[PDB]
Amino acid sequence: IAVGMIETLGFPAVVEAADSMVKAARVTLVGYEKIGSGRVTVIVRGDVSEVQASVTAGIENIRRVNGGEVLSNHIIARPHENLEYVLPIRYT
Amino acid sequence: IAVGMIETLGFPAVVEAADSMVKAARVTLVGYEKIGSGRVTVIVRGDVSEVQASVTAGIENIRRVNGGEVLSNHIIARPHENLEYVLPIRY
Amino acid sequence: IAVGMIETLGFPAVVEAADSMVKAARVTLVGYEKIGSGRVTVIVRGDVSEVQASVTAGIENIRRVNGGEVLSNHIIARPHENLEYVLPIRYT
Amino acid sequence: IAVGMIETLGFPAVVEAADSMVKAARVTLVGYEKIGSGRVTVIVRGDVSEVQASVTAGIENIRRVNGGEVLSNHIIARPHENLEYVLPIRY
Amino acid sequence: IAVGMIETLGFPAVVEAADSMVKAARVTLVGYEKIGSGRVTVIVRGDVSEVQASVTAGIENIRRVNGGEVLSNHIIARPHENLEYVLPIRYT
Amino acid sequence: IAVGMIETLGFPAVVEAADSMVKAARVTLVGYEKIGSGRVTVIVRGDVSEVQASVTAGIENIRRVNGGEVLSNHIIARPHENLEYVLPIRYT
């Protein structure tokens, strides 16, 4: 099950990211990760083509946030099961 | 139920943002989020017109905070229900 | 009941802020908030004129701190009761 | 048992580092450490040759993360047992 | 009872600050505060003359820490009792 | 009992620091301290000459870490017992 993630500077931009992602395709938002320096990431899971659709919509719609900025983004089609136990990418 | 958000650099400005928001319209302040680098966000919920009124007043009143600064802001008229269970935008 | 707050870069300056505020007028120190980046705020409650006296004394006396810096400050005369439940401005 | 570590700026890149590491060789991902300033490290354990294979693949695959950056990386073939009880490099 | 405080960038320098302070005079180290951005403060209590002796020796000894830096420092001879209940300056 | 500490920017360099220190002499690694800004310190205890040997090896071996940087370091031969109760330099 693919994982998609968008990392933004600022929390309003991240919420737009999460909303746009779950709206644009059949993905589940499973998490929100703060790592400091104002950097925050939202994580979704779903079929690779859906997750690809989600992430693309996310990066575009953040342009509608005043003071919005995307710092990074990425999709992994088939994450190894080891990640599910160590990183916060898992269904809760 | 719409969600409105103002992110400031500095805590005094966020308090003004929160105060102004709840006073300008029928919205509820539901949260305060710290993400580091001095960045703090206040979050309100309410009808989209009320939330829109709250956020514009917040951005304007932060200007009478000594050292106050708005970094970002945003409104989502109809956030997806999934957001309620993962992000701190909930009652 | 008014709320006053002074935000400094550095913890020694914030302690001077708290001390000067409770000394200069009839206000109660109710809180100390850290939001990262070395930014720290002290919060007092009291009558608006007292809180105004406190905050003014605070900003001046921080000039006596070696390496002291005030980043921001603010007073709200009559905060909405909603704030009491979400923000740490409350009588503990 | 060797320990391998890749530190990145940004969380998405750290996920790729972790995924690539466990896929490139017989290593176990045992941890994720945040130390502030956006710096995050993933830690694996395994035989030194496997760990060496895992870390080089991690550094290489981070390059297909939009906005990804490696800050540091390192392998210790035979870390001292004292490290296991103090640092998050264990189980 | 006076309070003295030295804030450094970096943890090794704060240890030297604490050590030097308790060795230079009859003060008690009561606390260590982290506020982010590498800024850490150590806090002692004692009579104002002792506390003054402790802080000046701290500032001076930090200079033999490789990579050490003092960011700020301060003494309050008679802090208000309200401070004891809100800030980490007391005997726990 | 002496205390030695090396502070690095980045976590991989700190692990090398800890490993090199416990390997180069008869010292115990007792702690790891994060204070933000990517700054992390490892702390060992032992006889002053051993601790001196450990810290020296630590700073040299960090040159073998890709992206490794030492920000500060320091040894205190005989730390005051007060520090043991306030700072994380203790046999936890």
Swiss-Prot record, chains B, D:
The keyword Magnesium does not apply. Residues 2-88 form the BMC domain. The keyword DNA-binding does not apply. GO terms for molecular function: structural constituent of carboxysome shell. Its main location: other. GO terms for cellular component: carboxysome. Keywords: Bacterial microcompartment, Carbon dioxide fixation, Carboxysome, Photosynthesis. It is found in: Carboxysome. Homohexamer. Interacts with full-length CcmM. Forms mixed heterohexamers of all possible stoichiometries with CcmK2, which might form dodecamers. Only very weak interactions with CcmK3 and CcmK4 were seen. Interacts with CcmN and CcmO in the carboxysome. The tight homohexamer forms a pore with an opening of about 5.0 Angstroms in diameter which is positively charged. Sulfate ions are bound in one crystal form in both the pore and between hexamers which may represent metabolite flux. The C-terminal flexible tail, which is the most variable part of CcmK proteins, seems to be involved in packing of hexamers in layers. Belongs to the bacterial microcompartments protein family. CcmK subfamily. One of the shell proteins of the carboxysome, a polyhedral inclusion where RuBisCO (ribulose bisphosphate carboxylase, rbcL-rbcS) is sequestered. Assembles into hexamers which make sheets that form the facets of the polyhedral carboxysome. The hexamer central pore probably regulates metabolite flux. Probably the major shell protein of the carboxysome, a polyhedral inclusion where RuBisCO (ribulose bisphosphate carboxylase, rbcL-rbcS) is sequestered. The central pore probably regulates metabolite flux. Hexamers make sheets that form the facets of the carboxysome. This is Carboxysome shell protein CcmK1. It comes from Synechocystis sp. (strain ATCC 27184 / PCC 6803 / Kazusa). The gene is ccmK1. The chain holds residues 3 to 93 of 111 of the full protein.
